[model samples]
Target: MKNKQHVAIFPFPFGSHLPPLLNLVLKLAHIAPNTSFSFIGTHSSNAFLFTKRHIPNNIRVFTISDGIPEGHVPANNPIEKLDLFLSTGPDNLRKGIELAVAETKQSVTCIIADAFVTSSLLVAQTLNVPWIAFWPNVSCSLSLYFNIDLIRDKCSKDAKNATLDFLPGLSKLRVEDVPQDMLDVGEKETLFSRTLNSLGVVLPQAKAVVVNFFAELDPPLFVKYMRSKLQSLLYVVPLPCPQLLLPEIDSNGCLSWLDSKSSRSVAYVCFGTVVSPPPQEVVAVAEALEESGFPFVWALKESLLSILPKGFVERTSTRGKVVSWVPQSHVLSHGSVGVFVTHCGANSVMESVSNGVPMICRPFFGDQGIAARVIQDIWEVGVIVEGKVFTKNGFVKSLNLILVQEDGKKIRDNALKVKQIVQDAVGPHGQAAEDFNTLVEVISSS
Candidate 1:
């Protein structure tokens, strides 16, 4: 009886998803100090969060098996791994919740989960607790997933080359802007299909759909579009500027190196943790960076060292810094980093925008492709690097254009403008603050 209302928070076990939810949890705890949390995650995900940030006192961290043999999820084939994990996730999550109830002796009054973890819906139903579907990705991505059935039904058979003019405020989208798997009707067994189907069935039953973007940036256009379509109440809680949780990495040398460079002169490049581009693309990027003559810092995984052109490292030793990991938010916040070259993961995109750094988008899979579209077409703060095949010349041209051309300055200006708006949105009287208070009241009443 001494403990306050208990909430179960189950975030999908992914690098980008964990941080935002943890940040959200911290903020919620700050306001409602008496509320308790059951923060559920996979073994590795729990370990990673503990390493990077402090778990608050009222929160009880819980782990469920991801159903992977040897418990190691490979980075190379993430989509396949996600499908396997989702297959077993529901049962595993149920057991984890039961264990939390038994050990803590507290009944969960409300449940919040990542939008992809549809199993949490069933768990919340069984326990008779109100459930909120938390969309860690931007609302645009959520809108696409929620309306995938309509897209499949209406889109042409050659949907790959089609435009998504049907979605509000996204008339500029080419099919390439959509996730490739969403367009493919051939594979219903994939994670993409499972997520789309689950959300379709589960979302309508949720208490409300909670998203991480504010009204200032994402606007209510798509939220209104989805509300009309699904008839679901959607809530927005804008994120505070990113805190750069990978503080464990030693960036002393990286910071020292940046101090010697000219302001906004270096190109900082990184694909998110889960993606590993092919060897040829690596070579192309290496050659392009060499040709561009701009000082750069590239974060490449150790597994990719074999693909670098021989003598590439030694020749560009003084001009470029290549490393396996970087303190990304710190690097983006630096005055020396003029442009960000990224894979357009939602986390990376928001981080870049918050720091007011322009991007050179090279999106890979999942929400990344759509995120790139948002940055290039919607936000106008980044340029999408185009080509079916990565070319040295293409990289050189993009770098020069964004860094040296008059057009680059315009993009940079738009990025700063968005940053200013974001700052205002997170300020005291902003929509985010109001939304945060409403969220607390909703959960408290539950």
Candidate 2:
């Protein structure tokens, strides 16, 4: 057997991005006895998730000042603290890494860096360690990043802004699909812009580019489009860690509640880790779910909860289980789960399909809108929450339609067919799984 290889897993501190790091790290740790993983983040105490769950000895956690002043704001608000990281993460992590190397007496051979921290790429380059990028979204989003230049060039001088209707897979894309930040013409310092800029400089340095997606689930149009844009190394790997103990959802308590339900009776309602609309909208969501009468696991994390209709929780208490954050994959995989109300993050989309659950798409930002379009409009495996004509009544009608309406039976059958496709993509020795194992071997060998 070969000597153990050490990889440092550094994720952006935000909740949404952090889970992917944890998922990847856990899978990497289990693959080879000769593999070990370490984490670098602000809150060292709560940093290593799988370790707390009794992960192998190969994985561990460490920390560096995220450049945010201690006690300035909650560590949970990583987006608020992004500026500090952008300005100082390169120097901070570079210094901390040298210290770690000296103290541990084990060299880090590779660095798996999140997209938000290109500074980690610099550290890897400075130390002569091979590095790979961990993109949290899908090929479609990466495709957009690569073609950002084309988006910029396509603007007619007379047009205030252009929303190109041309993307692979689905056609619901509008000017509305692009984030407001991308629409800004003058500002180069914004988080979205800076990250895009960094990709230009740092992506070329990567030995490999890894997107979190399975081959079958990934739209062919997106795969072709992204492949055409790339000049360097690139690969897609689906999330590997199976959330078995779904009852043990770390962030919240909804999963246990789901365990008691009948198979295909529950719908998992989550809008990713971000994008909580106003409380009034939350009430609309609550009303929609209530009107539908499907047993639901609703995760309401720090958005417009105050605006949830008065007595709403009390009214829906019987059928709805409200938690801050639930073990999503567990819920998705549960025999009780029939459908998903999702923000259309790639991971959630992949999970839903992998678990044979249909989707109600409400894409918030990033690639979510595109993902919604792909699954709902293109594949017909799900339905989209129409933002154009969205109203409380419409939201309620969709929930009832999706949950109780016999009309939903057709889409539900289509959804099951898509699930079979996802299974093939991620099954043992399948294309996605084979690619994942290849990635492990490559990083391990390096």
Find the candidate with the highest TM-score and give its number. Answer: 1
lDDT by residue (tens digit), candidate 2, 345-394: 87788788777788887776656766776677666878887553335777
> Candidate 2's C-alpha lDDT?
0.68
* Per-residue lDDT over 140-242 for candidate 1, one digit per residue giving the tens place of the 0 to 100 score: 8766766786676656554665777778866666766676667676544576466765676678788877777766777457767767655345445445434
lDDT for position 202 in model 2: 65
Lowest lDDT sum, 10 consecutive residues, model 2, at 154-163
Candidate 2 residue runs with Cα over 4 Å from true position: 1-4, 44-51, 74-78, 153-172, 187-189, 231-265, 301-306, 388-390
Measured against the true structure, the TM-scores of the candidates, in listed sequence, are 0.92, 0.84
Instruction: Give the lowest summed-lDDT range of ten residues in model 1.
Output: 238-247
Once fitted onto the true fold, the runs of candidate 1 whose alpha carbons sit more than 4 angstroms away are: 1-3, 69-76, 153-155, 158-161, 186-188, 229-246, 249-252
Return the number of clashes found in candidate 2: 0
Q: What TM-score should be assigned to candidate 1?
A: 0.92
